[PDB]
Amino acid sequence: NVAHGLAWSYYIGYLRLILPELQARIRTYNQHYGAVSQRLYILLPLDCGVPDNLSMADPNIRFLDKLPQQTGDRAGIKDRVYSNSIYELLENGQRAGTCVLEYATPLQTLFAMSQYSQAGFSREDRLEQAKLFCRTLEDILADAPESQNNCRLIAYQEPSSFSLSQEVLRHLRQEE
Amino acid sequence: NVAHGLAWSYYIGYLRLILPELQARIRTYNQHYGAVSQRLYILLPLDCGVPDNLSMADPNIRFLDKLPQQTGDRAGIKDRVYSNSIYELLENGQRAGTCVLEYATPLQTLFAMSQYSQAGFSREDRLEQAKLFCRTLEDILADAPESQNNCRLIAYQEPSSFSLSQEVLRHLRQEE
Ligand SMILES: Nc1nc2c(ncn2[C@@H]2O[C@@H]3COP(=O)(O)O[C@H]4[C@@H](O)[C@H](n5cnc6c(N)ncnc65)O[C@@H]4COP(=O)(O)O[C@H]3[C@H]2O)c(=O)[nH]1
């Protein structure tokens, strides 16, 4: 249902545009301005709980700097700019990884819609619409020319205690 | 169908955030840095044809400057910035108006989706999904606290010759 269009909007208006120029932006940040690994990691909490300050979700996740901004004219707005944050991940008090990680804001938009009444989005459908957003985005990236070893999806569901740093590092470790 | 979620995403992730701080940004541009009128005009072509360079849609529409950028932390991206362009509108070779006008990029996203095959969006449904995006966005703004005399929707359908400058000025004139 609604998650479909949100996934496609997420790809057509963002991933399709930044992923091609991401590895250049990363190569520039390592030099010009550990190293920052060459992939954008997208946090997909099925909870749809998308904090704005990441370190408050897990203190072991600590913001370090921003990438060199990428700009472009998009729909009559001169120099619309896409920014991306670089984060360090801690494990027992030491830097265990560094990557460009960020939440999927459509999930934050699925949350909000589930509370506006006129949106006709019953709030019990949150978890499924979240699941279809992941499943849909996943199939778009399977056939995406822009995604040629350039972004990794981190879906997860907090059941007690949970560590999102460990969650990320795991995906980060499995690539080496 | 899909236009619904695109309208809500357009409001929850954008209008709801910039409209509150728009009149401050405009008052600042008139002074600090005709005058720029205090409203964001959103071009909704039912054609869904959303050029990126506006002046190429109508040369009488000429870009002048940008507003003072507005920033905020959104979903783990530090200092995600919202920019908006200020345009001058000509009528027989003279400045007849000045406003913050921009296309609705969801319409550009409806176009693109109508050509990706796996998006399951038949391209004959473009005009209707465009019509439901306007009708839906219109009802969201009727009850929007953030929209208290702060943005005006410019829906239109090119049938021959057409002038989008004249189209805009008309809405601009009717407010005086
Ligand atoms: N982190 C990030 N994500 C972005 C950026 N641009 C797009 N995205 C992602 O793609 C979605 C759809 O983008 P869109 O350009 O097709 O429609 C956008 C666009 O029409 C409008 N919008 C948001 N930020 C804007 C901006 N800075 N300038 C102009 N329009 C903007 O609101 C819609 C929904 O935004 P959203 O943040 O909830 O979801 C984004 C967002 O998840 C971006 O610059 N940064």
Can you spell out the DSSP letters for B98-167?
Answer: EEEEEE-HHHHHHHHHTT-GGGT--GGGHHHHHHHHHHHHHHHHHT-TT-SS-EEEEEE-------HHHH
Helix (H) and strand (E) counts for chain A?
6, 7
Q: Where are the domains of chain A?
A: 1-36, 37-176
Distances from the Cα of B30 to the Cα of A163, B22, B89, B129, B148, angstroms = 49, 12, 17, 38, 20
Structure tokens of B120?
Answer: 């399951």
Is-contact B23 B37, C-beta < 8 A?
no
Task: Check B104 against A75: CB less than 8 A apart.
Answer: yes
Query: CA-to-CA distance for B53 and B62, rounded, in angstroms?
Result: 10
CA–CA separation, B173 vs B176, rounded Å?
6
Indicate the residue type of B54: L
**Crossing angle of helices B2-10/A2-10, nearest 10°?**
60
Which position has the token pair 């090119």? B158
3-state class (DSSP) for residue A135: helix
Among candidates B52, B53, B42, which has minimal Cα distance to B156? B42
Asked if residues B4 and B134 have their Cβ atoms less than 8 Å apart, the reply is no
Residue-wise burial string across B102-116, b where 16 or more C-beta atoms lie within 10 A, e elsewhere: bbbbbbbbbbbbbee
- The rounded distance, in Å, linking the Cα atoms of A52 and B72 is 9
| Tokens 């405009």, residue located | B26
In angstroms, the CA B129 to CA A5 distance is: 12
A80-85: long-range contacts at Cβ-Cβ below 8 A with a sequence spacing of 24 or more? A80/B83, A81/B81, A81/B83, A82/A14, A82/A17, A82/A18, A83/B77, A83/B78, A83/B79, A83/B80, A83/B81, A84/A18, A84/A22, A84/A25, A84/A40, A84/B77, A85/A54, A85/B76, A85/B77, A85/B78
Residues in contact with ligand 1 by the CB-under-6-Å rule are A 9-10, 13-14, 77, 80, 82, 102, 105-106, 109; B 9-10, 13-14, 77, 80, 82, 105-106, 109
SS3 state at B41: strand
Give the gyration radius of chain B's Cα atoms: 17
B82 with B13: CB under 8 angstroms?
A: no
Six-digit token pair at B79? 């200092």
Tokens encoding B173: 């004139």
Q: Does the beta-carbon distance from B9 to A109 stay under 8 Å?
A: yes
Taking each helix axis as running N to C, give the angle between helix B105-113 and helix B126-142, from 0 to 180 degrees, rounded to the nearest 10: 150
Residues found in chain B: 176
Encoded tokens for A145: 């020319």
Provide the shortest C-alpha distance from residue B142 to chain A (in Å).
11
3-state secondary structure of A27: helix
Side by side, the strands of the sheet bearing A40-45 are A61-66, A85-90, A95-103, A40-45, A151-156
Distances (CA, A) of B137 to A41, B4, B47, B143, B166: 32, 8, 17, 10, 23
* Ligand 1 centre distance from Cα of residue B155 (Å): 21
Query: What's A19's DSSP letter?
Result: S
- How many angstroms separate the CA atoms of B95 and A113, rounded? 41
Of A73, A83, A140, the CB nearest to B79: A83
Q: Compute the distance between CA of residue A56 and CA of residue A68 in angstroms, rounded to an integer.
A: 25
Q: Which resolution in angstroms does this entry have?
A: 2.9
